[PDB]
Amino acid sequence: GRMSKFTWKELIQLGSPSKAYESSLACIAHIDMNAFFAQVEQMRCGLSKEDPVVCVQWNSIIAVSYAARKYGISRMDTIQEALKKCSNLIPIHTAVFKKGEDFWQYHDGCGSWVQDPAKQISVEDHKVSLEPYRRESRKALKIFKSACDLVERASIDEVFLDLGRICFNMLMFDNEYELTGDLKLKDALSNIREAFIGGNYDINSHLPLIPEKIKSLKFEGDVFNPEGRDLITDWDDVILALGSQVCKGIRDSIKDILGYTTSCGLSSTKNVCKLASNYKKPDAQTIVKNDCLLDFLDCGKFEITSFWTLGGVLGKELIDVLDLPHENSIKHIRETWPDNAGQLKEFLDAKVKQSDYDRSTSNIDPLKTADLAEKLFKLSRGRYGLPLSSRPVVKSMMSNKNLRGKSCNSIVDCISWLEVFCAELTSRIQDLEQEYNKIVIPRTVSISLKTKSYEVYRKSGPVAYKGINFQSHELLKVGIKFVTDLDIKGKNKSYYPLTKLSMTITNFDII
DNA sequence: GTGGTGAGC
DNA sequence: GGCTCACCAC
Numbered sequence: 039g040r041m042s043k044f045t046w047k048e049l050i051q052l053g054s055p056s057k058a059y060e061s062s063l064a065c066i067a068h069i070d071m072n073a074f075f076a077q078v079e080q081m082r083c084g085l086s087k088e089d090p091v092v093c094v095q096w097n098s099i100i101a102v103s104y105a106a107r108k109y110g111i112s113r114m115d116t117i118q119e120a121l122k123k124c125s126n127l128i129p130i131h132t133a134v135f136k137k138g139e140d141f142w143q144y145h146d147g148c149g150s151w152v153q154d155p156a157k158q159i160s161v162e163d164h165k166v167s168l169e170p171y172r173r174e175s176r177k178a179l180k181i182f183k184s185a186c187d188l189v190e191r192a193s194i195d196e197v198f199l200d201l202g203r204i205c206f207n208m209l210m211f212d213n214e215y216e217l218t219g220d221l222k223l224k225d226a227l228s229n230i231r232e233a234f235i236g237g238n239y240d241i242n243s244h245l246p247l248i249p250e251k252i253k254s255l256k257f258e259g260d261v262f263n264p265e266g267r268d269l270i271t272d273w274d275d276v277i278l279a280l281g282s283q284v285c286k287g288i289r290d291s292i293k294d295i296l297g298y299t300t301s302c303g304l305s306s307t308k309n310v311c312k313l314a315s316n317y318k319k320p321d322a323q324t325i326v327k328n329d330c331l332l333d334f335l336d337c338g339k340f341e342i343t344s345f346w347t348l349g350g351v352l353g354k355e356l357i358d359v360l361d362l363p364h365e366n367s368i369k370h371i372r373e374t375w376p377d378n379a380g381q382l383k384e385f386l387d388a389k390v391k392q393s394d395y396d397r398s399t400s401n402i403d404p405l406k407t408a409d410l411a412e413k414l415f416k417l418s419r420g421r422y423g424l425p426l427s428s429r430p431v432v433k434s435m436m437s438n439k440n441l442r443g444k445s446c447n448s449i450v451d452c453i454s455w456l457e458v459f460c461a462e463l464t465s466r467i468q469d470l471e472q473e474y475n476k477i478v479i480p481r482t483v484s485i486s487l488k489t490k491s492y493e494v495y496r497k498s499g500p501v502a503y504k505g506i507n508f509q510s511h512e513l514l515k516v517g518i519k520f521v522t523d524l525d526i527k528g529k530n531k532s533y534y535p536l537t538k539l540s541m542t543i544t545n546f547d548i549i
Numbered sequence: 550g551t552g553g554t555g556a557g558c
Numbered sequence: 559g560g561c562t563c564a565c566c567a568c
């Protein structure tokens with residue numbers, strides 16, 4: 039009291055696209071798109087945001103627009119089953135390649151749920167394509183990178199944002215933003231701003247108490263506040279508010295430029311953000327103040343298994359290692375180690391060396407048992423700041439096809455599928471160039487296949503480039519050769535009908 | 550060198 | 559239930 043809890047160092051740190059995730063005064067934001075594949079379709083067919091449109095594949099649903107969710111339809115339903123829940127459902131099948139053609143297409147009006155035995159899309163001579171969804175994913179991304187200097191791509195429909203710089207700059211140099219009638223930020227934060235340029239301060243001096251006037255700063259979106267704590271008490275709250283503001287803008291552009299609704303979570307931790315974004319859907323924005331982190335993590339919807347990269351199996355074990363009750367398990371980890379990370383550290387040691395398990399089926403690395411420590415201890419409190427980072431360069435790319443029926447008998451059929459693969463792969467190589475804005479070419483190509491008896495033939499080798507920058511053809515040129523040798527490699531053995539053909543590319547070069 | 554199979558879109 | 563992708567014991 040009598041002075042803010044955060045120091046200048048922690049504030050100024052928001053302007054560093056490298057040491058920003060530390061401050062705790064951080065302001066990260068996660069954004070996921072609602073019923074994505076459902077939407078990009080809901081958009082492509084000029085339908086409305088409120089039409090029970092579902093995205094199907096063969097006989098299974100893979101995306102359910104929220105309009106059609108109101109009828110109880112979910113992912114664990116089959117087009118057939120779903121229609122009995124809502125006869126006005128608008129099922130739309132993804133685009134697909136046809137055995138033999140080097141281009142995918144949209145067979146609208148067609149689908150297994152169609153009576154006409156001619157408007158069917160057999161899974162025998164067709165392969166689902168996801169370019170459309172990738173094509174859109176990037177757009178949204180481009181729209182992001184234009185509003186945020188540091189953007190991490192979580193997955194095809196998710197992205198994290200480091201609203202550090204934008205918040206700091208707004209908090210210091212924005213002479214436009216208005217709080218209400220006649221009251222701009224330039225007057226409400228005069229004290230903090232005048233002090234900033236003054237430089238008269240030690241980077242360790244606790245910032246001044248937030249000006250009484252700033253409390254009239256409104257948050258944008260639902261502020262998780264069950265206990266009803268005050269909205270703006272310290273700076274981290276002020277920065278977060280400014281974030282929600284900015285964040286709303288970004289999310290509005292997407293909706294206007296592409297027309298995609300999204301859920302969004304704001305907090306000082308990517309992890310905590312990941313949760314908040316999924317807390318409410320669709321088209322909403324949850325906000326978890328640092329002084330609500332515990333109230334949020336214990337609202338009664340999360341567990342130690344709901345934590346990204348900790349809910350597959352390592353999470354399962356964690357329970358069998360710390361007893362971890364089957365409910366209020368997160369809080370339990372907090373109230374059992376109110377010491378520090380160091381405490382739980384040893385507990386891990388004196389819980390592994392004995393007669394409980396074997397280092398043959400445990401994802402818990404003994405030596406680095408200090409990491410797993412601080413991790414759980416931090417997560418439990420909602421303070422595990424992970425720096426945003428780019429996904430490591432791709433190592434490979436597979437264009438498979440689990441064949442069925444007696445389709446694949448001759449080599450002209452394999453060749454017929456190799457064209458397809460060659461297309462899809464010459465479609466993910468381009469999307470990669472655009473992402474790293476660097477030219478990419480695969481120096482090696484292999485072709486695997488499963489015979490009738492389910493055996494495995496595979497030939498791998500280099501790819502000759504008769505020029506300097508092609509692919510879509512020379513890839514099939516070689517691909518074929520292999521598919522031939524293998525054919526000869528099994529003339530009088532269990533071969534056709536094949537049960538799985540597939541082309542893979544590795545040994546990439548990023549010039 | 551991988552197929553087994555855990556993780557995730 | 560489907561389709562892709564990174565690893566790493568046997």
Ligand SMILES: Nc1ncnc2c1ncn2[C@H]1C[C@H](O)[C@@H](COP(=O)(O)OP(=O)(O)OP(=O)(O)O)O1
Pocket residue numbers: 070071072073074075076099100101102113195319320558560
């Ligand atoms: N079981 C599955 N089968 C096929 N595709 C899936 C499956 N699970 C996820 N996907 C992929 C295809 C979808 O376009 C994409 C959607 O992103 P996801 O994060 O799963 O949520 P969603 O967009 O379907 O709904 P939400 O609004 O809850 O985010 O995930």
Ligand SMILES: [Ca+2]
Pocket residue numbers: 070071072073074195
């Ligand atoms: Ca989603």
Ligand SMILES: [Ca+2]
Pocket residue numbers: 070193195196
């Ligand atoms: Ca997702």
